[PDB]
Amino acid sequence: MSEPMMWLLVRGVWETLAMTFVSGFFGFVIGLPVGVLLYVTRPGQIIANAKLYRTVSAIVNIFRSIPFIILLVWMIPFTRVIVGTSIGLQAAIVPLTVGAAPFIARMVENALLEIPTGLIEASRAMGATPMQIVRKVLLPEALPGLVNAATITLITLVGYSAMGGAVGAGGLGQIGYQYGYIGYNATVMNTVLVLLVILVYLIQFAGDRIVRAVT
Amino acid sequence: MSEPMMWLLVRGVWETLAMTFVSGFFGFVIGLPVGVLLYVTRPGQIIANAKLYRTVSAIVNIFRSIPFIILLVWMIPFTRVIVGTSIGLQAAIVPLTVGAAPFIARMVENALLEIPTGLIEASRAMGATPMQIVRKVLLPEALPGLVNAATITLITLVGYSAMGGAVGAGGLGQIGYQYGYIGYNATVMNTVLVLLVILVYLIQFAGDRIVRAVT
Amino acid sequence: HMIKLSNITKVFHQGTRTIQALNNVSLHVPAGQIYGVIGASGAGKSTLIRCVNLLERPTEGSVLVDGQELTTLSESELTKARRQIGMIFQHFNLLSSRTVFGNVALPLELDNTPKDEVKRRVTELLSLVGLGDKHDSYPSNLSGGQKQRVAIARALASNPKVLLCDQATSALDPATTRSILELLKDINRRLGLTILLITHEMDVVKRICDCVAVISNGELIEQDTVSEVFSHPKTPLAQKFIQSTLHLDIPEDYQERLQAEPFTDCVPMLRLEFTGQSVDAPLLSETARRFNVNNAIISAQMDYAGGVKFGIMLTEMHGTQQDTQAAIAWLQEHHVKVEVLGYV
Amino acid sequence: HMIKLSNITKVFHQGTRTIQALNNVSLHVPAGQIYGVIGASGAGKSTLIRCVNLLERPTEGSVLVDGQELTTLSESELTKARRQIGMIFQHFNLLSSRTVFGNVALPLELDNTPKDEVKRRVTELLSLVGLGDKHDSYPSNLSGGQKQRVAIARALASNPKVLLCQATSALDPATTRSILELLKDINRRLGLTILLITHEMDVVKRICDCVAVISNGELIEQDTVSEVFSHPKTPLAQKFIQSTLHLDIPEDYQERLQAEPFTDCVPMLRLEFTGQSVDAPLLSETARRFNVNNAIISAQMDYAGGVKFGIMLTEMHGTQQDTQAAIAWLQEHHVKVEVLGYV
Amino acid sequence: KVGVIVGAEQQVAEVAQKVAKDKYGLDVELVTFNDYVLPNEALSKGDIDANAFQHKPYLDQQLKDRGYKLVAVGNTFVYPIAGYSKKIKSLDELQDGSQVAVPNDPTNLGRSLLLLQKVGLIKLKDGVGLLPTVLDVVENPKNLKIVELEAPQLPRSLDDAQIALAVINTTYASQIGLTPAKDGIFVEDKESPYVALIVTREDNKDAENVKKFVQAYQSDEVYEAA
Ligand SMILES: Nc1ncnc2c1ncn2[C@@H]1O[C@H](COP(=O)(O)OP(=O)(O)OP(O)(O)=S)[C@@H](O)[C@H]1O
Ligand SMILES: Nc1ncnc2c1ncn2[C@@H]1O[C@H](COP(=O)(O)OP(=O)(O)OP(O)(O)=S)[C@@H](O)[C@H]1O
Ligand SMILES: [Hg+2]
Ligand SMILES: [Hg+2]
Ligand SMILES: [Hg+2]
Q1: Which residues contact D254 (CB under 8 A, 6 or more apart)?
Q2: How far does chain E reach from its first CA to its final CA, in angstroms?
Q3: Which residue in the set E66, E104, E162 is minimally distant from B85, CB to CB?
Q4: Are strands C294-305 and D267-277 parallel, antiparallel or unpaired?
Q5: Who among C79, C91, C140 is closest to A127 (CB)?
Q6: CATH (domain of D91)
Q7: Is some CB atom of chain D closer than 8 A to the CB atom of C258?
Q8: Under CATH, what is the fold of the domain B1-215?
Q9: Cβ contact (<8 Å) for B155 and A193?
Q10: What are phi and psi of D4, to 5 degrees?
Q11: What is the distance in A from the centroid of ligand 2 to the CA of B118?
Q12: Number of H helices, E strands in chain E
């Protein structure tokens, strides 16, 4: 573990961290509206529109069915349009975010589905607008499930970023692949693993603490 | 799309299919007991054991923090112990299964958490044993959430198998990467994408139909 | 007429079998009127009350609230209209994410009402329901009655023109119950609030209902004033139900000692039923003065409405068998339904 | 004594503030006895009944069921014991995954009872609660009363020695009477012990053998139905009982009421009977003696332990002097009389 | 900036970075890639200056597909590839149905295919050159089954009960101590067009920075350290 390897591990930590958290943030920014739609447009729900449900669900499934790599590639031009480059950290984040958003939306749908029926009935009876119900009932009442979903999703995003990072932004997982594994460096490998374990532990601790905070 | 390419796409379909479904099946075989534990040993639950909860949760997080590739490698020897080889379809499935099972368990834990409190109270009051409660209450009543989770998980496993297959496997995703993308063959790429979309649509349709079956 | 329901019919397809929860039911409620619904369990009551809110969409039928037909109305117009109607569910459907105060404030929030106004009005309501001290606790920390009163306060938050109660005082002790019903009556007579309510406590019905409706097998057997329903009702089904609401206790003590045959020095035991009798008319005082018989009230359920007194009364007719039978004859003359149960 | 609770105390820490839901409460129930719990909302009733089941672990207190102490008992022994106790929740806590039949069968399954036996017994129970035709429908498809009856049947599935019931709040009077008749039959046939919460005094004086009253987490008093509803003690308790009486004064009479007696007035008077001799004819006797006319406006009169109690609102017809003499006589005979006005 | 592959051909380029930031002191920002087109797309898009991983048939392919304007601007290392088996010391000891491990990447995939036609086991179709694929296998008397992994993974596949033979590169061969010429059972003679072929954009190839890096890359230290 030379001083250069120290700095490289530092930057790998920073890469994994930025990728995971930023990508999860924006993936939620997207999929949470998408999930709320998938929930709300179901047969029977506040704004029950089969056509719109099929459209949104179709988009979601379509994006889900693209392999990570083909997605990143097809994104490259629009990736540049956005961040001005198709390489490095932000360039990796963008395709990561698009890959994650549909899964996030489906997780959201799942969470909202576990909301009770009587509460939606009450919200409709009071005369609340769909967006009023969303902002005041659906998301508030489903908040524990939403937070647990976010926990799960970020834990996944750690390794997912590790994989997708290799357009010039690999993070700790890339480092472990290269220096820990490709060329037998037990120290580097163990350091990478310990950092990753600490990271997942921190994320799960935060998620569980927030969840239990909500009664 | 030559006849050899026809056959290759057939085999890629078969690989993606076997990988995805077999891996999900056994990943659940594993994680569902683990998730039930994570749920039951929580502070306050049927068998509330802090030490055991910490142990299981630690194991789960540890496995979650290992990158896919290091996992596959470290698995190689016991992968062989099990299937007699570290290459090909079954050899790819094994590490896939180990990678997915912890995520499956956390999804389960989430679902069970969405179970109501009064029902656990009643099950305990009747005098049911913990496993009686599990088999007669927890899993039945959480069945819609569990099925929705399984849907989500298999949709992920499609691309996850595409990635992890490349120890002699890979399925349609590998095919798309190599012949659709690395060799600019638009036909093959579009065919792979269409097959993947059809697969995800079938899976989501089955999941939604089964969920709606459960009222 | 603040409420008009016409030819309402509802089928449910549970599974294998289909059910006529409601079958061509029609009911009209004026403004500021109080109207009860009663009927054997599973008759349709809750379904009917939900039809007004349109939480249940009738397969064939017409709903009018405040002159506005709802069956044919846009979701947005329907939302705007529903902001006029308060409902109290049998199980309160409270938000766990919000304290007492938050749940009660929610409808006011829907109208984007000022924050200060929300504070004042919500506090007023909580004081009225006696939950002044519980404003900031969560439903998970509340006894049943407390949560029921939370639901009541929320229903009344928006000062709606119509209230739909589904057994809104079932989890409240007699005292709390009376306080709440007094409040409803005050509101009804102050702001002309119209009320439709389900109950199994006939007590409540004849406590505040102006008119009453009875339901059997998804059919509106009869509607009338409280008295007229509880007093010479029609429709063998309806009168059978009403009989069900009567006590007819025959305490086990008297059951043990009861003799079908009159013996010497026997004291007849007799059940009396008053069906729209003249309150001023003193009949048992008069009977005692006339025949020198003694009518010892064992049990009594007597209620007054629209200038008449009705209900059952279990009594002993004391005196000589002949005097007892003569007194019975006179009381029957004056339209008191008398049945001799035995001799004690 | 099938049930014994001693020095039970339970605190809850909601948030900022802590609450003494129960404070040193003790209560004993014999075998085959029926016992009611009543009290203003939020007093602890549900808390106490849950303490019996041990769904609430008393912070300080002792619980004994069938001679077995539970506070100090293993989870397994506790489970086995709980298979002796049926509970009916205020909200029925039914399984949506299982039909009526399944919900009812569950406790029998817990005992691995034979399949044929399960069919027979569950069918019998459903017939008894009148849910014979609903066995195969789901709780999501049931009216309130139906689901409540499902919960009742499940409570009774395993033929427990103890029942913890507002088990009749969602049932019309007729169904209510049917159900209570069934409970009484079981109590007198198989010596079933029952503890029940209710806000319907009707139920209380219908079947309760003894009654208990609760205020601010404290057991104010316990006595027989009559003694509680008739000259209760403890200003809190008697205040509550007064609350349970029908002091209606119909708006019609309120309008016409005059605090002052005028010529040809008819006094309006409330009467309260507190453990009065049922056989004793007082109003017929009054009519014969003073030639007054007592027109019963309203009446709540109930009989228990050889006595009749409750209030009665009436008109005293006749001459002001005759009316006052009759009132005096009735007061002599322990009838609590209050004159409200003159109509 | 310079593109690079995440393969083993990386310390080859770290010594070149050393010599470049040593003799010419230029803050070139390095990049590595886990796919085989993105360095080319980066060049054609202008992100990176150069790339030091492909060979002339592969280059030509990339100038044909996606229409990149690039030209070869560098000398290279020998990068020998060869067959290896820890199960056998001769091809006489190879039997039917035996599986054969080759790198799934296009360059080494095709070169291993041509090496396998050279050894005489299989034969492919006509008129291809250095980038054949499994599409092309037309003669397979022994019925070998072709396997496409990430190269680092096959050398232990020689330790696999299934695999009888693996077409592996020379640096990987030397990882565990197998030289091609003599330790490796059978080998590949000089195959001219596998050159590392340091590349740049047709426009940017004439920047001082580019030339000076290319110099730093081609030197005695880089040749001996290899
Ligand atoms: N969602 C539903 N699906 C199927 N059947 C239903 C549904 N809701 C109500 N029913 C039926 O409607 C019938 C009438 O019961 P309800 O109107 O719901 O309640 P109620 O009869 O008015 O009063 P209770 O709750 O029985 S005392 C019952 O037999 C139910 O089976
Ligand atoms: N688990 C709990 N956490 C916090 N507070 C509780 C809990 N259980 C009960 N309480 C409080 O304890 C008090 C009494 O609770 P209960 O026993 O349910 O009321 P009750 O005596 O049954 O009378 P009611 O309102 O008619 S059900 C109430 O103020 C509740 O808010
Ligand atoms: Hg009511
Ligand atoms: Hg005893
Ligand atoms: Hg009961």
Answers
A1: none
A2: 23
A3: E162
A4: unpaired
A5: C79
A6: 3.40.50.300
A7: no
A8: MetI-like fold (1.10.3720)
A9: no
A10: -145, 120
A11: 15
A12: 8, 9
